[PDB]
Amino acid sequence: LGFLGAAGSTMGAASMTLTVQARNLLQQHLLKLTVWGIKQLQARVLAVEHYLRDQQLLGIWGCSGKLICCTNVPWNSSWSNRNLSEIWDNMTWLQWDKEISNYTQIIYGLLEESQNQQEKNEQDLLAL
Amino acid sequence: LGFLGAAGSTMGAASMTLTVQARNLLQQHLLKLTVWGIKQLQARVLAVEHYLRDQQLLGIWGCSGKLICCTNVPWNSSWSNRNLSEIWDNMTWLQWDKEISNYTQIIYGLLEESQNQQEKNEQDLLAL
Amino acid sequence: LGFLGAAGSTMGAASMTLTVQARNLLQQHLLKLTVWGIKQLQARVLAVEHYLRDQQLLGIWGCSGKLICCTNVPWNSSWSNRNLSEIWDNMTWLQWDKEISNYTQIIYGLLEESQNQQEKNEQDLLAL
Amino acid sequence: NLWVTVYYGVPVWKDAETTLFCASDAKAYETEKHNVWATHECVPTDPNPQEIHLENVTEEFNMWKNNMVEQMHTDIIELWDQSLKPCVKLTPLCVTLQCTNYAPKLRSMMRGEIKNCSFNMTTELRDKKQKVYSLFYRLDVVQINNKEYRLINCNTSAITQACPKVSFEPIPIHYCAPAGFAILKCKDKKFNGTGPCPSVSTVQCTHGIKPVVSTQLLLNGSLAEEEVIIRSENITNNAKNILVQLNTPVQINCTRPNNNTVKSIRIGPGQAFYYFGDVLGDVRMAHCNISKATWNETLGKVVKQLRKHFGNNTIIRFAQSSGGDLEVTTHSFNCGGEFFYCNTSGLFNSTWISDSLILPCRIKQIINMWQRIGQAMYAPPIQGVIRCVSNITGLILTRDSTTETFRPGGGDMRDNWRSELYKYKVVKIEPLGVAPTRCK
Amino acid sequence: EYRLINCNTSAITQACPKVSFEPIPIHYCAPAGFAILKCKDKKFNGTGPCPSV
Numbered sequence A, B, C: 001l002g003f004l005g006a007a008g009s010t011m012g013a014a015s016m017t018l019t020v021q022a023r024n025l026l027q028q029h030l031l032k033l034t035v036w037g038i039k040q041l042q043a044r045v046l047a048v049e050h051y052l053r054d055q056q057l058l059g060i061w062g063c064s065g066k067l068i069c070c071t072n073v074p075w076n077s078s079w080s081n082r083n084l085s086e087i088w089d090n091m092t093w094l095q096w097d098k099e100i101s102n103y104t105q106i107i108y109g110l111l112e113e114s115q116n117q118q119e120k121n122e123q124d125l126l127a128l
Numbered sequence D: 001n002l003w004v005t006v007y008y009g010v011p012v013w014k015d016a017e018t019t020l021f022c023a024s025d026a027k028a029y030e031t032e033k034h035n036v037w038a039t040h041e042c043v044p045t046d047p048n049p050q051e052i053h054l055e056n057v058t059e060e061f062n063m064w065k066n067n068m069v070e071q072m073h074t075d076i077i078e079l080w081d082q083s084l085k086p087c088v089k090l091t092p093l094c095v096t097l098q099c100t101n102y103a104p105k106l107r108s109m110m111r112g113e114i115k116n117c118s119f120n121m122t123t124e125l126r127d128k129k130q131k132v133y134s135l136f137y138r139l140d141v142v143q144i145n146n147k148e149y150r151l152i153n154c155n156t157s158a159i160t161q162a163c164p165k166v167s168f169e170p171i172p173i174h175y176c177a178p179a180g181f182a183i184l185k186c187k188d189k190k191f192n193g194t195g196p197c198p199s200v201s202t203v204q205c206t207h208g209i210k211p212v213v214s215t216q217l218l219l220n221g222s223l224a225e226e227e228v229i230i231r232s233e234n235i236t237n238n239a240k241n242i243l244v245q246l247n248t249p250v251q252i253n254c255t256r257p258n259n260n261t262v263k264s265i266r267i268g269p270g271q272a273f274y275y276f277g278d279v280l281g282d283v284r285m286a287h288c289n290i291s292k293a294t295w296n297e298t299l300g301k302v303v304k305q306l307r308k309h310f311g312n313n314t315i316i317r318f319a320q321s322s323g324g325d326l327e328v329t330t331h332s333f334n335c336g337g338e339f340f341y342c343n344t345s346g347l348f349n350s351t352w353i354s355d356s357l358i359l360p361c362r363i364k365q366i367i368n369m370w371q372r373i374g375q376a377m378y379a380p381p382i383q384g385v386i387r388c389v390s391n392i393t394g395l396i397l398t399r400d401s402t403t404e405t406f407r408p409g410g411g412d413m414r415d416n417w418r419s420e421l422y423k424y425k426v427v428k429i430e431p432l433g434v435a436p437t438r439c440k
Numbered sequence E: 001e002y003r004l005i006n007c008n009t010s011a012i013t014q015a016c017p018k019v020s021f022e023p024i025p026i027h028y029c030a031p032a033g034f035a036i037l038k039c040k041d042k043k044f045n046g047t048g049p050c051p052s053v
């Protein structure tokens, strides 16, 4: 398809397109300062941290490197328990995402606590 | 506790707080140039490399990803051999750190040589 | 030897110098704006993405962390099949590299497809 | 039974503001060194128009809340200000002018229009002055009560010489978004202005935009594709203006048919300005032509689009514009060194129930761009004659029982660019996702 | 009557009578991810392969 090619597609169908989504991220050396040089300087900066802040988060979430990895925290079924075998390959990413959106903050702090706090101690506990 | 919450604590007690130490790192798009826009531009930059220069070092030291990992170089006991079972969970990080500080440069170049030079060859030596 | 010390050397001899090549990458806080402050600002920026764009590529190529790792895509022998046991530790990196240079773009997109597309699905296929 | 599974690279976005930058089509200019639009020091466009279609997905836009308008309207003012800075300030020009008419025996419309004038201009020496004969227009001088005249600016603003090597030709500008972002595209024909476009697609970098300045009409712009398309925000309000896009252009010819002469006088140690010295031949009005029968056929398409959702059993009356400044009253446009003011009363004299045409045109010298009281640019005169040929694309109207008055409006330059930015919006890519699956 | 040269063409700036003009030795550090080669070959032509780099 292409970059954002599987946008309105099945989540399982759009599972196998992640590489094209990640390649199409991040020129002219010797900038001046005048007008457009400001924006190109601003273009260089905003590409960095917006690449990087989530790249911090995968190290926070222990899922370092490109992996579709899964955690050890259970799914709370209070978060719209809707046929999670069926709906997982039915709708889209997109419309499903705003359904999740009211609780994503609650998830993330539990993610950095579940295996990232606990299961990152215990290999030192067996390191003897 | 919180960010820097276990500052004057036991090293083993402050072992289990590393996630809060790392989350509280790294806004306004469309900057102007005048006075405060310079500093906010400077605020964006200094957060990057001070996050990144040690993030290089863990790849240098082979301890990629958040791991409290240990090396294969032995501890030289000339570096203040003081009851390393006892003192390891007695004092603090802080006061112990400046005790180590006279030799930390000597450590780091051996770290990138011990398993990072040698033990990163030998898996290619068995790759046949 | 030193940084770029094994430049005109054997590829196997220059295999064991990668750490010095990577340490000698990436100051003055509180910059002004005038003339040299522009260039030092430009010096801070260009060190980041030129460190980072290939650092993206190893996560793209699945070879995250410093590893001399190998892929699962076979070598196409149309790309100058010249005594690949012999020549691999004969010439240099340098003169060999421009020989490869006409086909490196073709390689890289296959690299992100070979084990990075396919073999990164199938652990989810056995994740049941 | 289910555990949280993370996902990286999910095709999902939100809507956000971001900084956004130039993209030029790389040419070999090397003549005027740099124009007003800094095409130099702009990145060359990738000649690969990667335009990726989006299947079976919709998104409601709004052409009335595009922050891309406010970013660009900031920049056009600022680039204009940036190039205008290093040239000659005509501070000592604001003097007492002895003047008289130039062609005193003349019957035409140009009678009493060009004015011969006299100075005491400060030379490059401190204690040497100079009597200078020059020519000016009616729309540049003001009486004081060979009566004494005075320029307009000295009421309000100061004067900058307009750098007589640069040009003003509107270069097509592309807008590349930074990484981690994308630009959506509507692509739906007959798009309302605010609605879910079904046929969406996205690019990194938009198509060409010519930042032309124009009042009352939309010169040189982009065509429509199907028919006359009407857009506005609140069609029932009298405060919202009216955006009209046409499926076909009208070839307008415009000319300043005078063989002229430009002189030069050093007024400071390096300050040497150019002024409208003399006219060869004899004095001729500047005007513009238009195919009348084409334009009535063009305007006949408009009222059909009007009577669809407004005023079916109601007459449609066009009137001339009301009044105010010349910029909000008459057609005004630059055409490469000259600033025309063409009266358009002969295009809005018409009603409806159930062989060319000539517009007289005035020109000025001292320009107050974007209503900024405080800044005033003096354009230099141009030798030779002017032979501007242009299309037309759009129309800006306003609405004033079973009678309807549509007067031609304008004023805000930002409405020129909403006619070019309705096809786009800015999204922030989010490569995250968390689903429950069967693995622990 | 005499007249200065400048007034033909240019304008005049006072040259800030506290600064100096002594040419300080300047070094040029290249940024990271770059290097500066050095010829070091005696009798170098101006365009040629330096062996002693």
Ligand SMILES: *[C@@H]1O[C@H](CO)[C@@H](O[C@@H]2O[C@H](CO)[C@@H](O[C@@H]3O[C@H](CO)[C@@H](O)[C@H](O[C@H]4O[C@H](CO)[C@@H](O)[C@H](O)[C@@H]4O[C@H]4O[C@H](CO)[C@@H](O)[C@H](O)[C@@H]4O)[C@@H]3O)[C@H](O)[C@H]2NC(C)=O)[C@H](O)[C@H]1NC(C)=O
Binding pocket: D031, D032, D167, D169, D170, D212, D219, D220, D333, D334, D335, D336, D337, D382, D383, D384, D385, D387, D388, D389, D390, D391
């Ligand atoms: C809508 O689009 C149409 C495109 O179809 C635009 O029409 C074009 O407009 C340009 C400029 O108005 C015009 O170009 C002129 O062509 C002449 C014939 O080739 C050229 O001789 C002339 O070049 C001179 O002027 C330029 C600007 O000053 C200089 O860059 C150039 O070097 C030349 O300048 C020398 O000569 C002049 C003569 O007086 C002298 O004063 C100078 O000092 C210098 O010595 C122009 O480039 C195109 O011909 C037009 N094309 C058509 C088909 O008509 C139209 O302008 C657009 N509408 C609007 C409102 O912009």
Ligand SMILES: *[C@@H]1O[C@H](CO)[C@@H](O[C@@H]2O[C@H](CO)[C@@H](O)[C@H](O)[C@H]2NC(C)=O)[C@H](O)[C@H]1NC(C)=O
Binding pocket: D116, D117, D133, D134, D277, D278
């Ligand atoms: C503007 O008016 C002045 C009036 O003095 C004109 O100057 C005189 O013009 C006549 C013929 O044109 C000359 O014979 C005189 O020598 C001029 N007087 C001076 C003092 O030079 C001037 O020509 C007019 N401007 C134009 C463009 O015609």
Ligand SMILES: *[C@@H]1O[C@H](CO)[C@@H](O[C@@H]2O[C@H](CO)[C@@H](O)[C@H](O)[C@H]2NC(C)=O)[C@H](O)[C@H]1NC(C)=O
Binding pocket: D192, D194, D195, D232, D233, D234, D235
């Ligand atoms: C075109 O836009 C107009 C507004 O400019 C829409 O008009 C209103 O739309 C809302 C929501 O769709 C309705 O609740 C109102 O009843 C509409 N008012 C009128 C007078 O029509 C219009 O629906 C849009 N049309 C399309 C096809 O999108």
Ligand SMILES: *[C@@H]1O[C@H](CO)[C@@H](O[C@@H]2O[C@H](CO)[C@@H](O)[C@H](O)[C@H]2NC(C)=O)[C@H](O)[C@H]1NC(C)=O
Binding pocket: D220, D221, D249, D390, D391
């Ligand atoms: C002005 O409009 C004319 C049409 O009236 C345009 O001419 C057409 O341009 C397209 C695109 O290059 C060509 O495919 C057509 O063949 C042209 N038609 C004719 C009759 O020449 C012209 O490009 C427009 N010019 C501007 C500056 O907008």
Ligand SMILES: *[C@@H]1O[C@H](CO)[C@@H](O[C@@H]2O[C@H](CO)[C@@H](O)[C@H](O)[C@H]2NC(C)=O)[C@H](O)[C@H]1NC(C)=O
Binding pocket: D234, D235, D236, D237, D238
């Ligand atoms: C569009 O403008 C019209 C005015 O022509 C608005 O209609 C009136 O608005 C006032 C103030 O809100 C109300 O008191 C009237 O009752 C409205 N009249 C009718 C017939 O509704 C209208 O609200 C505006 N709509 C939008 C979307 O801006």
Ligand SMILES: *[C@@H]1O[C@H](CO)[C@@H](O[C@@H]2O[C@H](CO)[C@@H](O)[C@H](O)[C@H]2NC(C)=O)[C@H](O)[C@H]1NC(C)=O
Binding pocket: D251, D252, D253, D289, D290, D291, D356, D389
């Ligand atoms: C505007 O002027 C141009 C030339 O000045 C006109 O172009 C001519 O048009 C006629 C008929 O349309 C053709 O037969 C000629 O071959 C054209 N000549 C050139 C040089 O293009 C154009 O038609 C004029 N437009 C209007 C509306 O009158």
Ligand SMILES: *[C@@H]1O[C@H](CO)[C@@H](O[C@@H]2O[C@H](CO)[C@@H](O)[C@H](O)[C@H]2NC(C)=O)[C@H](O)[C@H]1NC(C)=O
Binding pocket: D329, D330, D343, D344, D345
């Ligand atoms: C454009 O030309 C028309 C020509 O009629 C001008 O209209 C005249 O304006 C004067 C001044 O108000 C009136 O006294 C006349 O009655 C008008 N004529 C008609 C037929 O109505 C018009 O003023 C010109 N445009 C501008 C901006 O001045």
Ligand SMILES: *[C@@H]1O[C@H](CO)[C@@H](O)[C@H](O)[C@H]1NC(C)=O
Binding pocket: A076, A077, A078, A079
């Ligand atoms: C799931 O979320 C609800 C709130 O929506 C909460 O009350 C409940 O305790 C949560 N379940 C678990 C197992 O944490």
Ligand SMILES: *[C@@H]1O[C@H](CO)[C@@H](O)[C@H](O)[C@H]1NC(C)=O
Binding pocket: B076, B077, B078, B079
């Ligand atoms: C430990 O450090 C001392 C210097 O303090 C050094 O003399 C000694 O050789 C080191 N021991 C080892 C095993 O390297």
Ligand SMILES: *[C@@H]1O[C@H](CO)[C@@H](O)[C@H](O)[C@H]1NC(C)=O
Binding pocket: C076, C077, C078, C079
């Ligand atoms: C190797 O490359 C050649 C082109 O040089 C191509 O024709 C051939 O199919 C390639 N071989 C394989 C196995 O892909």
Ligand SMILES: *[C@@H]1O[C@H](CO)[C@@H](O)[C@H](O)[C@H]1NC(C)=O
Binding pocket: D096, D097, D098, D118, D119, D120
């Ligand atoms: C110029 O100066 C002379 C003498 O100073 C005076 O007679 C004349 O009226 C002045 N003319 C103008 C236009 O200022």
Ligand SMILES: *[C@@H]1O[C@H](CO)[C@@H](O)[C@H](O)[C@H]1NC(C)=O
Binding pocket: D142, D152, D155
């Ligand atoms: C000065 O400006 C006022 C309004 O701001 C206007 O009425 C007046 O005519 C102007 N005077 C001149 C000489 O332009």
Ligand SMILES: *[C@@H]1O[C@H](CO)[C@@H](O)[C@H](O)[C@H]1NC(C)=O
Binding pocket: D259, D260, D280, D384, D385
């Ligand atoms: C204008 O006058 C000059 C006088 O030398 C002549 O050479 C030129 O051809 C004239 N141009 C026009 C358009 O009449």
Ligand SMILES: *[C@@H]1O[C@H](CO)[C@@H](O)[C@H](O)[C@H]1NC(C)=O
Binding pocket: D296, D297, D300
């Ligand atoms: C314009 O055309 C319409 C019909 O096509 C006609 O009724 C009207 O009189 C025409 N107007 C002019 C000025 O020719």
Ligand SMILES: *[C@@H]1O[C@H](CO)[C@@H](O)[C@H](O)[C@H]1NC(C)=O
Binding pocket: D345, D349
């Ligand atoms: C409109 O045109 C007619 C003739 O075509 C003329 O008699 C009338 O005065 C004009 N009115 C206006 C307002 O231009």
Ligand SMILES: *[C@@H]1O[C@H](CO)[C@@H](O)[C@H](O)[C@H]1NC(C)=O
Binding pocket: E005, E008
């Ligand atoms: C002014 O410059 C010209 C050449 O540009 C030169 O011939 C002339 O002598 C100069 N005049 C003075 C006073 O320096």
